[PDB]
Every structure is written in C-alpha cells, then in structure tokens.
Design a protein around this ligand. Structure first.
Ligand SMILES: Nc1ncnc2c1ncn2[C@@H]1O[C@H](COP(=O)(O)OP(=O)(O)O)[C@@H](O)[C@H]1O
Ligand SMILES: Nc1ncnc2c1ncn2[C@@H]1O[C@H](COP(=O)(O)OP(=O)(O)O)[C@@H](O)[C@H]1O
Ligand SMILES: Nc1ncnc2c1ncn2[C@@H]1O[C@H](COP(=O)(O)OP(=O)(O)O)[C@@H](O)[C@H]1O
Ligand code: BEF
Ligand code: BEF
Ligand code: BEF
Ligand SMILES: [K+]
Ligand SMILES: [K+]
Ligand SMILES: [K+]
Ligand SMILES: [Mg+2]
Ligand SMILES: [Mg+2]
Ligand SMILES: [Mg+2]
Lengths: 528, 528, 528
C-alpha cells in the first residue's frame, strides 16, 4: 500500500555499514576504564549522562532508512546482550561492527555469504568452548569484590558494598538498588519479615520516640478475610487478655465495629493490641499470609480449604513472635516461634515453584518470599548530588550487580579483552570444509582482537602494539589500561564474568553474520 | 469520479515490464543453494531478513502506477503459488517474468496475443503431463529427509528433524512449528491426550517436584455442563471412594459449592481427586468432550441428546485412565481404557467429516482430534540467538515441511531445475494449429530453461553453458550448484516435489499469458 | 453558487470530440476475434484484465471537463446497451463515436442539427426495419452453440457448455454463473427442490459417508410458524411411527422442547426423523413453503387464511417424497408425490405474477420458483488459475449467456458486422424531406460500415478493402477475421443476435445525434 525503495548490491551494504559504523562509533567511546560518557537529550526534562552501551544504542535513530536498518540491527545486538547477561553491551556492539565490516569486504561474485555465516558460527562455537575450558569458578569474596569493582568502572567502594551485601544476604539473595537522598552510598538490610503496611489507626502507639508500636513476645492472629463483626474479634482478645500478651492482628482490613472495639479497649483498659493490613492484592496476599503463618506458627482464618472460623480461635492457633515493630508505613516481625521443619518444607516448596515456568512477575515474588523466610533483603541507596549523577551511578551499580551474579553463576576469565585474545590459537586447529568457511573463520579470528584494541585506544595508546605484546606474552599476562602497563590480571583483579563474554560474542556474531548475507534492501519512501 | 490516465501500445507494456523486472530481480537473488537474503524494513520494529520469494514479493510496492500494475500481477503469481503448494515462489516469479518478457517481444501488428496465450497454455499442459509422467513416488524415509534438506537451503539438521518427526507421528500427522528460547532446534512429541487446561485450585498437588498432580489408574468424570450443586458431585465421589481410585473431573467449570467440597475432602480426608476445565469454547468443546469420553470409555453428563444427570452416575459410566498428569497450565491423559472398536469408529467418523467441505477453521480441528486420538502431535521449537534469526530459520523450516508434505502427496522429480529441462523434448512433438500457437509454444520452450539458469547464475557461473551441458548429458545427470559439478541428482538427493514444480509453472504461465494480451492500461492520476 | 466556464461554437465541440475519441479508442481495441484486452488499475487490490466494452468505458474519467462530458455521454451509450441487451457494447461505442464525428463535421452556419438528428433517427428506423426483415429464428441447438461460441470470443468449450445447459434445463431456464476453484469449467444441474438450509442438530445423520441424511418415501410436515410445544409435534411423530415412515419437518425453526424430543426419540428409539429450517426471510418464505407443499402434496400449518393447527395433523395432510437428502448446508427433495394438475396450476399462477410489473428483486424469485417446480437450475463454475483469469472468463461467459438468451428471444443475423452492411441499400430508397435530413441519412449510411471496418482493422488488415469486397460479394458471403478469408457466415457459424445489433445501433444513434446538436457547453471551473 506504501511505495517502496529497493536497493541492490554494494550500495545498500555501504549505507547499512554507515549506519552500523555511526552507532558503534557513538557506543565505543564508553568502553574500558578510560571510556567517556554520552549525553542524551530527553524530551521532557534534564538530559541523561550515561556510560552504558545499550542506553546509548537505544537512543540513536537515523533519518536515512538504510542507515536506520543497520542501526536497528546493532540495537538488537546490544539489547539482546543486555537482556541475557545484563552487562557487556559495548563489547557486543564493537564485535558486531567488526564482524559486519569484515564480512562486507569479503562479498564477491563467487563468494557464498551463507557458507561464510556457517563458518563464522562454527568458529564462534569453538571460541565459546575454549572460553568455557579456560574459566575458573568464584570461591572467595575477594573475587566477588574484584568483579564488582571492575564492572563499576573501577569504583572500590561500590565493589566493597556489593561484596558486603552478598556476604550478609547470601550470594543468591535479593539485592535491590534505589536512589538515595544522601551524598554517599548506603547499604541497609531488612531481616525477619517486613511488609509495607502500617497500623490502621494511630492509637496503638506506645513508644512515641519514633511514633512506633513495639511488642515483645506477642501473639499473632492472621485472617484471610476482613474482621468486622464483634464475635469474630472478641475471643482472640479474650485469649490475649487471659494470657496477658500483646496481640497483632494481620488481616485484609478491620471494619468499623471491630476497629472501634480495639481502639476503645486500648484506650480505656490499656490492653496491648495492634491491627495491620495484609500485604498483597491477589493470590500473593494469600501466599504471604500463609508464609507468615508458617514463620510465626499458627493458622490462617478464612481459607477456602480450611475455613477456620474466627469464633473457634484457640491459644495454640495464634502465632508467637519474639518481637513486632509497627510503624505508620510498615510492619516488621522478628523471631517467629514456629517449627523449623515446616519452615524448611515451605522453603523447598517455594524453590520448587521457582522452577516450573516464568511469567515476568512471579519468580521475583518467589525470590522475595524466600528472602523474607530465610536471610532478608539488601537495599543499596545510591547517593549523589543531583538526579543525573544518581542515575549514572545507578546504572554503574546495576551493571556491577549483574556482573557479580553472572560471575557467581558461571565463573570468571581474564579481563581487558584478553579472554578472547587467548582463544585465537583455538581457531588455528579448525579445518574449514570449503573456502567460505575459511573466510568466516578468518573473520572471527580478526574480530577476536577488537575488545582489547578498543580498550587500548580509549586509553590514548596504540591498540595494535598493545594487542601484539599481549599475544607475545605468557598466558597470565595482560594489559592494565588504567595503570597503563602489562600486569597479571588475576593478581590485579581485572577479571570478567565468562557468561558476559560468551553472551556478547554469541549475540554479536549471530546478528552480524545474518546481516552480512544480504543482497537487496527494501525500505519505505519517506512520505513524512 | 476520479480522473484517469490511459496509455496505449508499447509504452504501457514497457512500464509494466519495468515493474515486473524490478520485482523479479529483487526476488531472484534468493534462488538456489547460493542465493542471498533480502532485508525488508518493518514500520514498527526490527527489520526482517528473508530468503522467501513470496515474502520479498509482497513487500514491494512502486510509486508508478504502471510499474505497480506489473508488480501486483507478479505478486499474484507468487501468492497463488505459496497458497497452493507452500513452496516454489521464486521459481514461479522467475517463470512469470520470463513469460511476460518473451511475450512482449512477440506482439506485432499481425500477431494475436489471445492465440499466443492459447498456445502457451497448450504447451504448459503438455509439460505438466510430461512432469507427471516422469515423477516417482516417495517410499523411504531417506527420500523424506533429502526433500526436507533441499527445501531448507541444504540444512541437514532440519531435514533430519523433520524426517524423525514424520517417522514418529506418521507421514500425515500434525507437525507444528514455533519459536524456541534455546539456541538449537528441538523436537517434542505430545502423545495420548493433552489439552491446555490446568487444575482450578492448586490444592490437589500431591507430587510437588514440578508442582504437578499424578494419578495412576484413575476414574474420569466428563460433564458437558458446569458442576455446582452438592448433589451433582457427591455420588461420583462416593463411587470413587468406595472403589478407592483417584478421580479426575473434566467439566466447563466447577462452581463454589462443589469446588469447596472437593478441596475440603482432599485436604482433610486425603481423598485423591482433581478438577480440570473443558478444552474448547463452542461446538469444539462438545466434540473434544465426546472424543475424551470415547478414548477413556464412559459417558458425557449434560448432553442435549442423552441428558445423563450426574445424580445417576454409575461405576461403569466413569472412564478409566492408566495415568493422568495435571499441571498448572495443561492436563494430560495416557492409556485410556476404552474399547478399540469405538475408537476406530470415531476416527472413521472424523476422517469422514474431514471430506465434506472447508471453513478455514474446521479441518485443522479435525486433524488435531485425529492426532490426539491416534498418534499424537509433533512440535518443532526453532532455536536462534535473536528474533530475526528465528524468523528466518522458521521460514526455512515451514518451507521444508510444506515441501515434504507435497512430496508425500504427489512424488518427486529431479532438482536444480532439471525437471523442467527434461520436458523440452515433449514440446517438439506438438503441432501448433497456427503461427500464434507456435509462438506461444516457443515462448514456453524458452522459458523452461529459466530456473536452472537462475540457479547457476546465483552460483557465480555462466548459466547458459551449465544448461547446455545438462541438456547434452544423460537423463539422470544434472548440476550441483552447491558442490559446483555435474552429478546424479537422485543419488545426491537433489530432488523436488513434483506438485511444487507443476504448481509454480501453471500459476506463472496463467498469469503472465493474460498479462501479455494487453493493449491499453488505465490507471488513476496520482492526486496524492 | 459555483463559478462556471462557458464555451461556444467549434472549440467546445472539438474538446468533446477529443473526449469521445479517447474513450472510444480505448474501447475499440477489444473488438472482434483478434481484439486485445485492457488492464484497469483497482484501488483496493489486483488490477482487472477485461475485454468488455462497458467495463472499459465505465472506468475512464478525464480531468478536463469538456472531454469528460464527451466521455460521460459515450459511457451512457455503452451502459444503456449493456443494460438492455447484455452484449454489443463495443459496437455501440464505435457507432456512437462515428456518428458524433460525422455530425460534427456537418455543422455549418446554415445547417440545422435538429433536422439532421431527425434524419438520423429516420435512417436508423429504416435500418432497424431492414434488420428485422432479414433475421431468422433459432431452431437447432447447433445454432445456440454457435451463438454462444461467437459471443465468448470463439471459445468452443463455453459454447458447448451453454448449449448443454440450455438443452438440459430448457431454453428459458435458470442458468447462474459463479467462480470455480478448479482449473476447468464445470456444469452442475440442481433438480427437484433444493434450498440452502441444512439440519439443525447433527444428530439425525444416518449415512456418515458424507455426513448426510437420506430418507426414502418420506413424510413431509411443513409449518409456517415455529414448532416449540410438545403438543405441536407429538401427533405428527405418532402418525409417522404408526405408518413406519421417516418424517422431514420443515419450519422456520424448532425450539428447545420439540428439538429435544426429536433428538431424544432419534437417539433412543431410532425413529427416522429430520428437522430443517424454512428457506426465505419474508413473503418469499411463505411462497416457497406453499410451493413445496404443492409439489409434495399436503398442507401448510400456520397460514393466516387456513390456520391449520398442528394438533389436528392427519395422515393425508402430510406430503410424500420419493427421496429426501439433508446435508449440513442444504436440503433436497426429489419425487414429490403430489397431484400434477395442482402443480401445473401453481406454475401458471407464477407465470401470471411474472407479467404484472417489476421490482428489481421479484421476477428473479418467480423464475427461481418455476425452475424449482419444473426443470431445475444450471450452475456454471468457471475455472481458472488466479482471480483475474476467472473474472475475465466470467465476463466472457456472462456475455455468451446474454447473447444466447437474446438469440432465443429474437433470432439471428450475419455476424462480423455484415448485418449492418447489408442494410446500406435500404437507405438508398429513402427520400429526405430537406437537405438536413439527407445529411443525417448520409451520416447513418457512412456509420453502417464502422463495425466491420473496426473488426478488420483489429485483425491487422485494411478495413476499407475488406468492407468493399464484402459489399461487392453475394448476400450470404462475409469475412472471417479469425481465419482471415471470405466465407459463408451462416455455414461457418458467425452469427449475431439481431436484438443486440438493433439495440446497439438505436442507443448509439440516439445519444450521438443529441450530442451533435450542441452549440454551447457549460462546465464548472476546477476549484479542486
Ligand atoms: N583496569 C582495567 N584495565 C584493562 N581493562 C579493563 C580495566 N577495567 C575494565 N577493563 C575491561 O573493560 C571492559 C568493560 O568495559 P565496559 O565499558 O563495561 O564495556 P561493556 O559494557 O561491554 O562491559 C571489560 O571487558 C574489562 O575487561
Ligand atoms: N545443491 C543444489 N544444487 C542444485 N540445485 C539446487 C540445490 N539445492 C536446491 N536446488 C534447487 O533450488 C531450488 C530451490 O530454490 P528456492 O530458493 O527454494 O526457490 P523456490 O522458493 O522457488 O523453491 C529448487 O528447485 C532446487 O531444485
Ligand atoms: N470469427 C469471426 N470473424 C468475423 N467476425 C467475428 C468473428 N467472431 C466474432 N465476430 C464479430 O465480432 C463482434 C464481437 O465483438 P465484441 O468484442 O463482442 O464487441 P461487442 O461487445 O460490441 O459485441 C460480433 O459482432 C461478431 O459479429
Ligand atoms: F556498557 Be555495559 F552495560 F557495561
Ligand atoms: F522461496 Be520458496 F518459499 F522456497
Ligand atoms: F463488449 Be461486449 F460486452 F461483448
Ligand atoms: K560502556
Ligand atoms: K527463495
Ligand atoms: K469487446
Ligand atoms: Mg560493564
Ligand atoms: Mg523452497
Ligand atoms: Mg460480445
């Protein structure tokens, strides 16, 4: 329905390479310790300052249609790498540009670009096998700190903070990053159980130092349904008063009659009691209710299976907590007196539901439930002066967290781009089936030097000489661009997650090889 | 109402041929083993990379009205071939361009384009008869693998996967293609009966390894209507408890009372039971309910003809299954203990409804029902790195499946375009009625060489010499463009479905002959 | 309210003649056996390829207002001819152009265009009288086949198919043309009574070979109103069961209670029964119900005049059919055991309502009812490869059908344009009243040679010499442009319906004579 413009042969390839070169040239200035930042104008407000490869890649769109085709393909490379590994997007971008540029030169009348792509994929598989062969697992927390430091543009403090958080919540715990109102980064740990639901009526406050309600050795009444009637709340209060212990009432809500009874009894008698809304809004509400029931040790009133009416409440059906703190915003329970076997059984159940499928919203909830059950969560408040600084440092901290998680999962290799450099000899043991496969293998062999060359170039030195001296040295020696000298990378802590490297290489090679198999490009005539 | 532009004679033909030439030149670069891909810009997101003839054809629209008329006619050729045979669109496109170009040169003051078209169709009928004469049926699975490999651009793995799927589900089974999240292609076979309806309440889980419910030697209660009353569910539970066997309850839904009873009995007593919704939404729901009832062996409660009330449920009216697995997303029944004669009668019934008419939605459902009844379904998850790769490989896999189905239906002939080359002698035994019929026969004779010449040209060699050496050789010898030498096509497995070849030739000839009978072209003046 | 442009004298005539010449030049290339096709761009989809005069005429609109006035007048000529005779539109177009061009040259200061028009109309009346004098009726089916062959651009197969259909359904039967999904034309005859209403519930199927229900020697119950109550269906079933004969129940619909009873009895007892909806939606529903009742022999329950309640159904009030076949889509009744005198009386009634007036929807319905009552209908499924081919061949088949009907109505004359050529001597016996009448008679005399000249010119030969040799030959000799030699038209089967010829001549002359009486042309200034 719309008129089309068709281009053939080398002209379309030249325009697409122009687009790829522009996008990758913009991205590549942010690579390595001596990389610089990119300023991206935002339509609504203040501009963004970023050193992130995918953020720079996604913000570039070109007026020309063929240049935009090339730019969109490189954007796909960077976005796929970011989604899979969470880091290494600049490396993927520069690898993709190298592969596209090397493959466009090899297209001839007799060349077969599909067999060239087959050879490229074969070489990439060989290099990935070599990378997995030469990686080693992460054992000490010092390696975790070093990985987090390298991924955060050489910030020692960020790496130390991430290492401390992983030590205190586990290598596979829940760590969140949020902006901070202070000037320095802060790490806070939420232990026990804590949910963002405060007391309903500010009449149960008995401390007033921070407008909070603390109870020690308290009873817990968890109800699936709302508590509104007098008969549904009186027996629990009777048991609490007979046992002379404070009572926390966690429910969806407390309606007028029961709430009025609670406030009147608290004000007149002085009975210790507090009411809290139930965290969650759907099935998650029931799941967290059951989780708190197991952690404290008791029962949930109003379940569709048990249907335990509140009238027949018993002293043994109320949970016990060592301490409960209720603030206007959030409620927190510590030292639930529940049996440990049931808690471990629930944890095993949750990890089993963690391995059925994904829904983009559920596995995060299961991980949060496990963190609340077992070891708490860590929160990194990123400090800064203005919003742009906080956003830049937040991107760096997120990159460091993703890289540390990848290193925990799969291990580490040499940093600085030397991991791919050491895989060049693995490509000399291959026997290409035909000439086009040999061309593809040579393309990958030439591409493997690109990350180290780019890192050296950003440092102001000649990349070719640096790469040659790296390859002529021993296998444990690489180049420190920050210091500017040849060192032992493992000793100095310049290490990279092997998952990041292999993901970047695979995505870049896969997309650029398919790009270099084109002969005709069809675009839309620019009506507007 | 709109002003028109009228063109006469050779000028209109020249413009229409310009459009045809442009579209076919874009399409023809993707022909044969050494063909290349075409990049098509998408308005919404990432561009498409395709080697498919119809996909490239449908994406080309021209600003000029006469060129667009030619382009639309060639699009009709490619689309008709794709709809009929599912493959051979590039061959049809190049044949159509050849016929149009050869027929435009023969138009003279004394020439009769209608008689030329009559001669063209006569020659095409003769060539189709010769093609049917020289075809042979497919007998061994190796031929199936070879056809699937050739149609998938020479991918051995795709051909092997398709051959395995056809072996394990039958040559006329149900094979589906979907994208995969992994890097490699995978083939999964669904046996027995399986529908995408999981358990209603996650309280019947008794395994917890994968959050699934397994029952062995279970009773099955299938109800057409919803189960809501206590009286409509109690007797079935009574029979199941007396016989001490688990019970699956497949229905449209289970409302509050019956569901609450089921969960209460499962939680307290521990009675084995599970509830599943009914697959389908209209008449298909009833059809599949009857199918599962026949497969397991029992009755459907709530039918408009039988009206078997759930209250009078009997032990002999409940189906028996060797094993049932209910997962949160889907339910699966294996080893239904139903009589085989009734199953065969139902299968015959369904194949009979397969042969009444078509409705664009129904025969697929009947085929799915047969697959569920008899041999299961096969699913090919196509692996790749990015979405563009998966889409390209998915187009190739779909082409391979269509070609394999056509080869099973009608047989095979020599590949590489030699099947049409061997039909040239059949046109020398014709006696044209007049001069125009002779012109048409010569047009078809010259056109028959086009596919082989195009395949050879895409390989970087001279097509004319290759075709001459093919014609001067023995009938079993042709040209391997991938290897680049003259071989035995049947021995090397370069074979084509005869249905694809005859469909492409027929559609191309039919449309191009009618195109070449024009003297006046009327278009709309480009107001916008 | 809108500014106008006024033109006087010969300039306006020149512009109008330019428009007429353009439209008629586009139309005239499609005339005769050696005519070519015209491609018309369609806004929505694929372009049209047509050899039809009116289709080409209606698709031409010109930017210039005076040229568009001329084009609109020629469009009126072609549309009137198509509406009246269904064929001969190209002949009318060329005749109109000839008359306009010849009359524009004769306009002088002293000439009287109104008297010229009077002379033209007088000459046309004389020529029409001569044409009626020299025509002969159609007697043998071979002449029918020849007329259908000539009108279908010399397609023998189309003529044979039309002749067979006319033989098997009558020369004045109902023949419909629809597209076919096959490659070849097919003729299917629907006998007896058949309506597009299948069974309601697919539970009465007792054959399963084609999912159909066959009954032999069946009872028929026709009800004007819906059957919903038990008492309105039980007595008919009782009569059918006592007489042990199957029962077809034709009504508007069968509601829940009666339908449930029917399915229950069919499933359990095995009683032979079937239910079918009533064809039609308004008064036509009642008319066809009465027709079916008369054909089978019985009564309609629920008429506003008889009001025969279903409760008092009698064995003599149910129709008898030799055989009834009910499929999913349509129902068919054969060998109704009704008295023949009533059937003939009903047929006479319907032919009498055929001759009262027209409503653009009713006489077609009456003809359909007669065809269902007496001799059935014929359906021509036109085969082709693509939609454009099917549309072109469908236009040809419709033209052939219209010409065959006209030949049956009024007779035949010599084809090839010789019928008008033989009427030239009839214009030499006229005595013009004045000079302007003589001018008009000479205009018609010169115009009478135009169809033969155009047919000869399209064949690539000199039209003037061909026409001269035709006029110098004997009255039975004409020119075969397809063969290209002088032959006997009646012997060779080159004949034309006299109605078509006289309609074309009358329409063209009438419009062009009025066009040539203009002195001032007023158009709208082109604001947009
Ligand atoms: N001090 C250093 N000396 C040499 N190379 C370094 C140093 N610090 C980091 N690198 C290298 O720089 C790369 C990180 O660059 P970065 O901007 O994060 O790109 P990406 O986003 O692709 O990871 C890593 O591969 C790492 O090996
Ligand atoms: N190795 C080969 N050598 C020679 N010809 C081949 C080879 N592989 C495939 N072909 C030919 O190439 C054609 C396939 O081209 P393709 O791009 O699929 O066009 P289409 O879409 O029209 O089928 C087939 O007709 C086949 O005969
Ligand atoms: N074989 C033939 N030789 C000579 N004249 C023919 C032949 N076949 C058809 N004709 C003439 O050609 C005319 C048909 O032209 P056609 O394209 O149908 O124009 P129209 O639509 O005005 O009838 C008829 O009048 C017929 O007499
Ligand atoms: F540029 Be990446 F996100 F380290
Ligand atoms: F181009 Be076809 F779909 F093989
Ligand atoms: F051009 Be006509 F309709 F034969
Ligand atoms: K970066
Ligand atoms: K192709
Ligand atoms: K015509
Ligand atoms: Mg990084
Ligand atoms: Mg193919
Ligand atoms: Mg005609």
């Amino acid at each position: 329905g719309s008129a089309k413009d068709v281009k053939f042969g080398a002209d379309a390839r030249a325009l697409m390479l122009q687009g790829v070169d522009l996008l990758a040239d913009a991205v590549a200035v942010t690579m390595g310790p001596k990389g610089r930042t990119v300023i991206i104008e935002q339509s609504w407000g203040s501009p963004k300052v970023t050193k992130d490869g995918v953020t720079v890649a996604k913000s570039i769109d070109l007026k020309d249609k063929y240049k935009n085709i090339g730019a969109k393909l490189v954007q796909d490379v960077a976005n796929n790498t970011n989604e899979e590994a969470g880091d290494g997007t600049t490396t993927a971008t520069v690898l993709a540009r190298s592969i596209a540029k090397e493959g466009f030169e090899k297209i001839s009348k007799g060349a077969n670009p599909v067999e060239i792509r087959r050879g490229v994929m074969l070489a990439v598989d060989a290099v990935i096998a070599e990378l997995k062969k030469q990686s080693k697992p992460v054992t000490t927390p010092e390696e975790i700190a070093q990985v987090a430091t390298i991924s955060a543009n050489g910030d020692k403090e960020i790496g130390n903070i991430i290492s401390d958080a992983m030590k205190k919540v586990g290598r596979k715990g829940v760590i969140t990053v949020k902006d901070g109102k202070t000037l320095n980064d802060e790490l806070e740990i939420i232990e026990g159980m804590k949910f963002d639901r405060g007391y309903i009526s500010p009449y149960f406050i008995n401390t007033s130092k921070g407008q909070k309600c603390e109870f020690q050795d308290a009873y817990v009444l968890l109800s699936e349904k709302k508590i509104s009637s007098i008969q549904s709340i009186v027996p629990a209060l009777e048991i609490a008063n007979a046992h002379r212990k404070p009572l926390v009432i966690i429910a969806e809500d407390v309606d007028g009659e029961a709430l009025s009874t609670l406030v009147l009894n608290r004000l007149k008698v002085g009975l210790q009691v507090v009411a809290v809304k139930a965290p969650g809004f759907g099935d998650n509400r029931k799941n967290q209710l059951k989780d708190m029931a197991i952690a404290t040790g008791g029962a949930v009133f109003g379940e569709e299976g048990l249907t335990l009416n509140l009238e027949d409440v018993q002293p043994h059906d109320l949970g016990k907590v060592g301490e409960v703190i209720v603030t206007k915003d959030d409620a927190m329970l510590l030292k639930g007196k529940g049996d440990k076997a049931q808690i471990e059984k629930r944890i095993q159940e949750i990890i089993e539901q963690l391995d059925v499928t994904t829904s983009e919203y559920e596995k995060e909830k299961l991980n949060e439930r496990l963190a609340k059950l077992s070891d708490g969560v860590a929160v990194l408040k990123v400090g800064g002066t203005s919003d742009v600084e906080v956003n830049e440092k937040k991107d760096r901290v997120t990159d460091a967290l993703n890289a540390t998680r990848a290193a925990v999962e799969e291990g580490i290799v040499l940093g600085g781009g030397c991991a791919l450099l050491r895989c060049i000899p693995a490509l000399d043991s291959l026997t290409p089936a035909n000439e086009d496969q040999k061309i593809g293998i040579e393309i990958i062999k030439r591409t493997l030097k690109i990350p180290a060359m780019t890192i050296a170039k950003n440092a102001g030195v000649e990349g070719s000489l640096i790469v040659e001296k790296i390859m002529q040295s021993s296998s444990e020696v690489g180049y420190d661009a920050m210091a500017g000298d040849f060192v032992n990378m493992v000793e100095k802590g310049i290490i990279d997650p092997t998952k990041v490297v292999r993901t970047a290489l695979l995505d870049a090679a896969g997309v650029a090889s398919l790009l270099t198999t084109a002969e005709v490009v069809v675009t839309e005539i620019p009506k507007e």
